[PDB]
Structures are given as structure tokens and as C-alpha cells.
Amino acid sequence: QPGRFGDIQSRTVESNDLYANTALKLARPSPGMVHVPYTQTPSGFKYWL
Amino acid sequence: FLQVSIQDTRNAVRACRIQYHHDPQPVGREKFTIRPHYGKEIPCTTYQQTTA
Amino acid sequence: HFNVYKATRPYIAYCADCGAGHSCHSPVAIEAVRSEATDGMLKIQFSAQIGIDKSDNHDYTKIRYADGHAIENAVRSSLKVATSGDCFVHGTMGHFILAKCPPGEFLQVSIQDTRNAVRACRIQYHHDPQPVGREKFTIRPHYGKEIPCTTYQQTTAKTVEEIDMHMPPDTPDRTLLSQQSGNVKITVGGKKVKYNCTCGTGNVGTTNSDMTINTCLIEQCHVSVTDHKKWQFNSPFVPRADEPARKGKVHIPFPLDNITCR
Amino acid sequence: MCVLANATFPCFQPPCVPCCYENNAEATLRMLEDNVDRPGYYDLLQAALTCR
Amino acid sequence: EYKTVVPSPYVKCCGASECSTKEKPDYQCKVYTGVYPFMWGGAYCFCDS
Numbered sequence: 143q144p145g146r147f148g149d150i151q152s153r154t155v156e157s158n159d160l161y162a163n164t165a166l167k168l169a170r171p172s173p174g175m176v177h178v179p180y181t182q183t184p185s186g187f188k189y190w191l
Numbered sequence: 192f193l194q195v196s197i198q199d200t201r202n203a204v205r206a207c208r209i210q211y212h213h214d215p216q217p218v219g220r221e222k223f224t225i226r227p228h229y230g231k232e233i234p235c236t237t238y239q240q241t242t243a
Numbered sequence: 244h245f246n247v248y249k250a251t252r253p254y255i256a257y258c259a260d261c262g263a264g265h266s267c268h269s270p271v272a273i274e275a276v277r278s279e280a281t282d283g284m285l286k287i288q289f290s291a292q293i294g295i296d297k298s299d300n301h302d303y304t305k306i307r308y309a310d311g312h313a314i315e316n317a318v319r320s321s322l323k324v325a326t327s328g329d330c331f332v333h334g335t336m337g338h339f340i341l342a343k344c345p346p347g348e349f350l351q352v353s354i355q356d357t358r359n360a361v362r363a364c365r366i367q368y369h370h371d372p373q374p375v376g377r378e379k380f381t382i383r384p385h386y387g388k389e390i391p392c393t394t395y396q397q398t399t400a401k402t403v404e405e406i407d408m409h410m411p412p413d414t415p416d417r418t419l420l421s422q423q424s425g426n427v428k429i430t431v432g433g434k435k436v437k438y439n440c441t442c443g444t445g446n447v448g449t450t451n452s453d454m455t456i457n458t459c460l461i462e463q464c465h466v467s468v469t470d471h472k473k474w475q476f477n478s479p480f481v482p483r484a485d486e487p488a489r490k491g492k493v494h495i496p497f498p499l500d501n502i503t504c505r
Numbered sequence: 506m507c508v509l510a511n512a513t514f515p516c517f518q519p520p521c522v523p524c525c526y527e528n529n530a531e532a533t534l535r536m537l538e539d540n541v542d543r544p545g546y547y548d549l550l551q552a553a554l555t556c557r
Numbered sequence: 558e559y560k561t562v563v564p565s566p567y568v569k570c571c572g573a574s575e576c577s578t579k580e581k582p583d584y585q586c587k588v589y590t591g592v593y594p595f596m597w598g599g600a601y602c603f604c605d606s
């Protein structure tokens with residue numbers, strides 16, 4: 143679950159797969175700019191630390 | 192505190208400093224520091240550069 | 244050996260504010276700040292690459308930067324990285340700059356332009372380090388233990404790292420159109436400008452030399468320098484040239500290694 | 506292991522040797538832009554931008 | 558920790574672009590219409606809307 147421990151998970155350090163659940167959401171850009179605004183819940187690893 | 196300083200004719204610093212408790216809060220509900228690149232526009236007041 | 248920094252050029256991006264509370268396209272735009280170093284040493288990223296002259300030669304004095312689709316160089320001195328106080332600069336190569344700063348809430352990077360004006364970009368960043376161990380000291384003492392920790396090295400060997408480059412977009416401009424009398428001319432200098440007009444079925448395509456319309460006003464033709472010839476960057480602040488993209492790969496310097504701290 | 510249209514040449518010895526970038530820079534960038542997914546990309550990039 | 562990858566936006570003007578799905582972790586994509594971009598020299602994509 144996003145915002146807590148295990149927001150992203152990998153079976154192994156060398157494994158290619160990944161499962162991430164971080165609620166990454168997009169927003170409409172403001173007039174007269176090119177910037178791709180997004181919002182996202184902060185990483186769980188930092189807050190567990 | 193704040194001080195103001197200018198050089199004299201002979202390159203000697205002249206300064207004066209006064210006690211003043213400066214602590215602004217931006218208008219709104221967040222106490223952010225500098226403006227971001229995506230957000231709302233809120234009315235506020237400022238001094239204009241015109242000398243009219 | 245290889246000189247990978249020949250197919251890269253500085254670009255101009257959009258900065259949140261220029262040190263005064265107003266936003267304008269600066270050549271010193273700040274990209275992501277990485278701070279995964281245990282002793283607390285930041286890897287800031289410019290938009291204008293450093294340590295290389297205009298002529299693609301490794302020089303410890305000329306720093307490249309972009310201005311109106313033209314690359315100029317400035318003196319390495321006056322490169323100031325600032326926080327609540329005044330930081331110290333350790334490394335310098337490519338787009339990346341290694342800094343060590345006192346605790347603070349925002350950081351700015353500033354350089355002198357060709358005509359000696361300060362160009363500065365400022366970004367909010369809650370920097371507050373904690374030294375490794377169980378005591379929150381400030382500077383190393385002259386008698387203590389040794390603990391392993393991590394930091395960024397100055398070596399530039401193989402690093403197994405990625406940064407993505409792509410061909411720059413069609414840069415728009417309006418200066419190159421000059422209206423004299425019922426006609427306009429397009430400025431030249433090597434930029435194979437792409438043009439599109441509306442008067443009389445218009446004229447669509449790209450040219451390489453001076454051209455004249457003789458038919459309509461300025462507000463129907465457009466100047467879009469294609470440039471090409473050089474990878475710029477994958478930045479979020481500049482558009483792409485094709486949907487499926489092309490993408491490139493460049494190794495970044497300053498990897499991570501173990502050291503000992505006191 | 507790298508490919509150019511219908512060439513299928515070893516990545517260690519590109520057919521543009523020497524001075525690929527100097528002889529045709531745009532072709533060099535386009536050719537490198539089709540080998541990003543190929544494992545043998547770094548040797549190709551080393552060979553492309555190395556000539557005396 | 559995770560690393561949010563934000564590729565440069567693609568602005569197709571005097572036309573439209575269609576979003577497509579890809580197999581990437583927490584992949585997100587959208588299209589916005591009615592944009593008027595600006596750059597350092599002047600607003601490109603002459604088509605007004």
C-alpha cells in the first residue's frame with residue numbers, strides 16, 4: 143500500500159520484475175507551459191526509515 | 192536585525208543596523224518558501240516599481 | 244580515448260524563479276537533486292554542462308552554456324552554489340556538480356554570463372543531514388573511532404549508469420523574419436529553418452539560404468530552426484520530435500563507493 | 506551483434522571506421538538510436554566516437 | 558526507494574494523438590486538448606486551438 147513499507151517490491155535484487163503501488167497521478171498542464179504536472183505519495187522506504 | 196551599508200568617498204564602509212523581527216508568512220494555508228511550477232494563483236498585495 | 248561529450252549541447256529550460264521572484268527561461272535550470280550519500284554530499288544537476296569549452300575540448304576553465312541556439316562559454320570561477328549559507332564545491336564534470344552545504348531550506352546555483360550578468364536558478368529543497376553514528380556532531384574530531392560510510396568518488400571510469408539523450412525539437416523564433424515592404428526575409432547562418440505560410444497556398448518546407456515571400460505579412464510565416472546534428476537531453480521541460488522517440492545512453496560520472504568516517 | 510538496415514555487423518568493428526562522427530555525424534546518431542535495446546551498445550558507442 | 562521517470566511530453570499540433578498502453582509498473586498516460594505551448598523565442602504550433 144502506498145505511503146508505507148513495501149510500496150515497491152521485487153522478488154530479488156537481480157530480478158527484472160517489479161510491483162509498485164504508489165498512486166502516481168497526472169494533471170492538466172497550465173496554459174502557456176510545457177511541464178507535465180504530477181502528484182505522488184512520498185516513498186515508503188524513507189518514512190519507514 | 193537589518194543593517195544598511197554604503198561606501199564613502201574614500202572607500203570606507205558606513206553602516207547602521209537596527210533591531211527588527213522579520214518573519215514573513217506567505218498567504219494561503221501552506222508556509223512554503225519559494226513558488227512552485229504548478230499551482231493556484233491567489234490575490235495578494237505588493238509595492239509597485241512605478242514612481243507616479 | 245572516447246570523447247562522448249561531443250554529441251551533447253547545453254540547452255535552455257524553465258526555472259521556477261530566477262532569484263528574484265519571477266520566472267524566465269534560464270540557461271542554468273536545475274534538474275533533480277540526488278542525495279543518497281551517507282556523509283551528506285549532494286549531486287546537483289544543471290541544464291548547461293560544465294568543464295568543456297565551446298570547441299568540444301576538455302578545459303578546466305571554460306563552461307558551456309546555451310543562448311539563442313548559440314553555445315558560449317563562461318569562466319569556471321564565479322560558479323556559486325548557495326544554501327542558507329555558502330557551500331563548498333568538490334567535483335565538476337558534464338551536467339553534474341558535487342556540493343556540500345550547511346543546513347537550509349532552498350538552494351540556488353548562479354554563474355556569470357558572457358557579458359557579466361548573474362544568471363541564477365533557485366529550487367526548494369529541505370536539506371538537513373545526519374552524520375552516521377549515534378552522535379549528531381558537526382565536524383570531525385581529532386580522536387575517535389572509524390565507521391564505514393558511503394560517498395561519491397571522483398573517478399570517471401566505467402560506472403554502469405544511464406542518462407537519456409534525444410534530438411532537440413523544432414526551436415521557434417520570430418527575430419529571423421524581417422518585413423521591409425510587402426515582403427519579408429529570413430535570416431541565415433547555417434540554421435536550416437522550416438517555414439510555413441498561409442498567403443497564396445502558402446509555402447511549406449525547409450530552406451537553407453535567404454528567402455523572400457513578396458506576398459503576405461509577417462503574421463503568416465513561421466521560423467522553426469531544426470538544427471538537429473546533436474543530442475540534447477530527455478528533459479520534462481522541452482517537447483519531443485516524434486511519438487515513438489529514439490533515445491540515447493550516456494554514462495554519468497561520480498559513482499558510489501565505501502569509505503571510512505571518524 | 507549490431508544491425509544497420511540489412512547489415513548485421515559485429516558491434517566491435519562498425520563499417521564506418523574510422524571517424525564515424527566526423528564523416529557523418531547524423532548517420533552516427535541515428536545508427537546509435539536503433540541499438541539502445543541491443544546488449545552490445547557500449548562497445549558500438551566507443552567505436553563510433555573514437556578516432557585519431 | 559523508487560525513481561519516477563517522466564519522459565518529455567509529445568506535443569502534436571494541427572492534429573491529435575492517441576494514448577496507448579504499455580507494460581510498465583504503475584504506467585500512466587493521458588492526452589490533453591486545447592493546449593497553447595510557449596518557448597523562449599515564441600509560441601510554436603501556429604494552429605490556435
Ligand SMILES: *[C@@H]1O[C@H](CO)[C@@H](O[C@@H]2O[C@H](CO)[C@@H](O[C@@H]3O[C@H](CO)[C@@H](O)[C@H](O)[C@@H]3O)[C@H](O)[C@H]2NC(C)=O)[C@H](O)[C@H]1NC(C)=O
Nearest residue numbers: 154155156157281391392393394395396498499500501502
Ligand atoms: C560496500 O561494501 C559492501 C559490503 O561488501 C558491498 O556490498 C556487497 O556487494 C556485493 C556485490 O559485489 C554483494 O555480493 C552479492 O552476493 C549475492 C549473494 O548473496 C549475489 O547474488 C550478488 O550477485 C552479489 O554477488 C555482497 O552481498 C554485498 N554485501 C552486503 C553485506 O550486502 C558494497 O557493494 C560496497 N559498495 C558500496 C555500498 O557502494
Ligand SMILES: *[C@@H]1O[C@H](CO)[C@@H](O[C@@H]2O[C@H](CO)[C@@H](O[C@@H]3O[C@H](CO)[C@@H](O)[C@H](O)[C@@H]3O)[C@H](O)[C@H]2NC(C)=O)[C@H](O)[C@H]1NC(C)=O
Nearest residue numbers: 438439440441445446447448463570571572602603604605
Ligand atoms: C501550416 O499551417 C497550416 C495552418 O496555418 C496547417 O494547416 C492545418 O492543417 C490541419 C491538418 O492538415 C488542419 O486540421 C484539420 O484539418 C481538417 C481538414 O479537413 C479540418 O477538417 C479539421 O477541422 C482540422 O482543422 C488545420 O485546420 C489546418 N489549419 C488551417 C487550415 O488554418 C498546416 O498543416 C501547416 N503545415 C504543416 C506542414 O503542418
